[PDB]
Structure formats: C-alpha cells, structure tokens
Homo-oligomer: A and B are copies of this chain.
Amino acid sequence: IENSAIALSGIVSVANNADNRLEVFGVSTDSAVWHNWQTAPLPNSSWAGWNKFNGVVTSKPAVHRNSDGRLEVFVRGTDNALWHNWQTAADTNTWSSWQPLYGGITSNPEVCLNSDGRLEVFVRGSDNALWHIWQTAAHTNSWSNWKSLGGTLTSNPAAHLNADGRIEVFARGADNALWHIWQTAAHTDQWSNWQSLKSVITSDPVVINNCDGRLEVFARGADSTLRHISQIGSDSVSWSNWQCLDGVITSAPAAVKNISGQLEVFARGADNTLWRTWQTSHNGPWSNWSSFTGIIASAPTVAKNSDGRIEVFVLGLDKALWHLWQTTSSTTSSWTTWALIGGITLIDASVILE
C-alpha cells in the first residue's frame, strides 16, 4: 500500500433506535438507500426486510439518532449537495422524503450529536476544506448556514464528543498525517486551529471514548497494520505516542467499548477474514488478533444491542449483508457464524476522494 491509500470502508451505517433496536442503512444496485431493522431488541429477533427510500444517491449514508429518539440519515445527492431524511416519530417506519441541506460535498458525510442535543454534520467541501452545518435547535428542522473550518482533507472526517461535551474532528491531511480540530467550548461555535497528530494513516480515522474520558483514535498505518493514540487527559492538551499492533489489516477498523469498559477493535485481516482484538485488562495490552471463519468484502460495521451484545455487519461474497453476534452479554460470550440479511445486494457508494 501507498501512503495515500484509504482502506476499504464499511458497507452500511448502523444506529440504535430509541428502543435500542438496530437499524442498518446501505446503498443498493439502484443507487438508492435501503434500510432494514431488528423487529425487537432481543437476541433472536427477526429482521423486518429491506425497505427503500426513493431517490438516487452518491455517497455512503450516515445515520444518527436525534436527541428525541428519531433516526436521521444524511447522504450526498446526484447534485453533489447534502440531503437528509428522518423518522417522523421515534421507532416508527414513517419517514420524510429526502430534503435538501445544499452545499457542495466531496466526502461521505459524518454526523455527530452535540452535548446540547443538536445534530452536526461534517464534510469535505468543494475546496477540500472541512465544512459543517448544524441544527440550531435540538431535534428540529432548523439548520444553520454552511460554515468552513478550513484545512485540506484527504480522508473522510470522523467526529466524536469529548467527555466534557466538546466535539472533536479527525481527518487525514495533505501530508497524509492525522490532523484534528475541536470545539473549545462545549456545543459552541468556537473552534481551535488545526493541529497535527503526525503519523501517516491509510484509512479513515476511527474514534471512541474510554471509561476515563479520554478519546482514543484508531487507524491503519503506512505499514498496513492497526495503530492507535489516546489523549493523556487530566486537563492536559497532550496525546500519547502512537502504537502499532502487529497484523496486516485490509480494511478500515471499527472500534467498540464492551459493557466491561474495555475496548475492542474489528478489521478485515490479511487473509480477508474478520479479525478481532481486545484490551485484555484495563487500558491493557491488546490481545493477538482472533479470526472468524469466512471471507468478507468490506470493513466491519460494529454495534451493540440493547443488552450489550456486540454485533458485526459485513459485505459478503454474494454482495449481500451478513452479520454475526455474541450470543450472550458476557465479555467471554461465544459468537455466531455469519448469517445472511437477505433481500438486496449492496454497493460501496463511498465518495472516491481522489
């Protein structure tokens, strides 16, 4: 791999509904977004079947739950502008049509919830800068104008809340390094300058919060292995050194915090199967990678069920969505084998960033 590579992305975006049922969003061969969901938040739930949103799209969709429980999806349209749709009532299959947010978008959209309930969307714009737009009232269709945060992006953005409620955004720069920018006051339009975390990355960055309130960032490195970095915390503006983990990965990573508070990461491995690693103690060292049977054709998308069980979604060799999951809430639970969520086939609609 070249320093400017961007590892294969996940094939769906996933959210928990207000009642914690999982719901997935992808793009089919008709270039429309389709979605599917658990019919109940139970370990044996059926899935509803694939349902289409009318309209042709031109990015991977991004979904988030509003602070009033309603899911809302963001996507680039055929006009290269940002569009969104939403549940009109929480937990209900009554959706808006696609509605315009305008702009000129040159990445997949990334959505985050501010600590005051307002959704915020981050994209690369027509000038390769980071641009953003936000709800001006929590869980309302009153959106700001577009505003630039500058920079020069070469990955999709990844956004996450700090423990103190400040959004922080991570994106690869023109030097192939990881850069980041943050709100300097929680849920306010007061932002830092861009700063570099150094290190070349070859995937989009993925971010999660630890127990202790420290963000941790994962990405593939120049040598095609997973690497990670974390905030020092305790009111320091600093970050740790980077660490790599042995094992060549061949997709973006996906991180999750298990219900014991430990981090886990999933990624497609060198043999094209799903790999998993976990922290073996608090803050710990990391386990050797463990493999699940079966060749997969995307990065994993990882979620947690109502009961904490971890569930993983991937593109199969049949171009359909498959999943596996923990059979119990235990961190030592056994896992299922891949099962098909059939009814459509999927395409990787991610925006080709070059």
Contacts and interface: CB of A to CB of B under 8 A. Distances in A.
Interface of A: 17-20, 41, 66-70, 90-91, 115-118, 138-139, 163-165, 186-187, 198-199, 211-213, 223, 229-230, 232-235, 238, 240-247, 259-261, 277, 280-289, 306-308, 329-332
Contact of A261 (B19, B139, B213, B243): B213
Contacts of A116: 19-20, 41, 306
The complex is assembled from copies of this chain, and their number is 4
A165 B281 contact: no
Contacts of A331: 234
Contact of A240 (B66, B115, B287): B287
Contacts of A288: 238, 240-241
A281 B214 CA distance: 12
Contact of A90 (B67, B163, B232): B67
19 contacts: A18-B67, A18-B68, A19-B117, A19-B138, A41-B116, A66-B69, A163-B260, A186-B307, A186-B329, A187-B306, A211-B261, A213-B260, A229-B285, A235-B332, A240-B286, A241-B286, A243-B244, A243-B286, A282-B283
Contacts of A330: 235
A277 B243 CA distance: 12
B241 A287 contact: yes
Contacts of A329: 163-165, 186
A41 B188 CA distance: 11
A332 B306 CA distance: 34
Contact of A308 (B117, B163, B284): B163
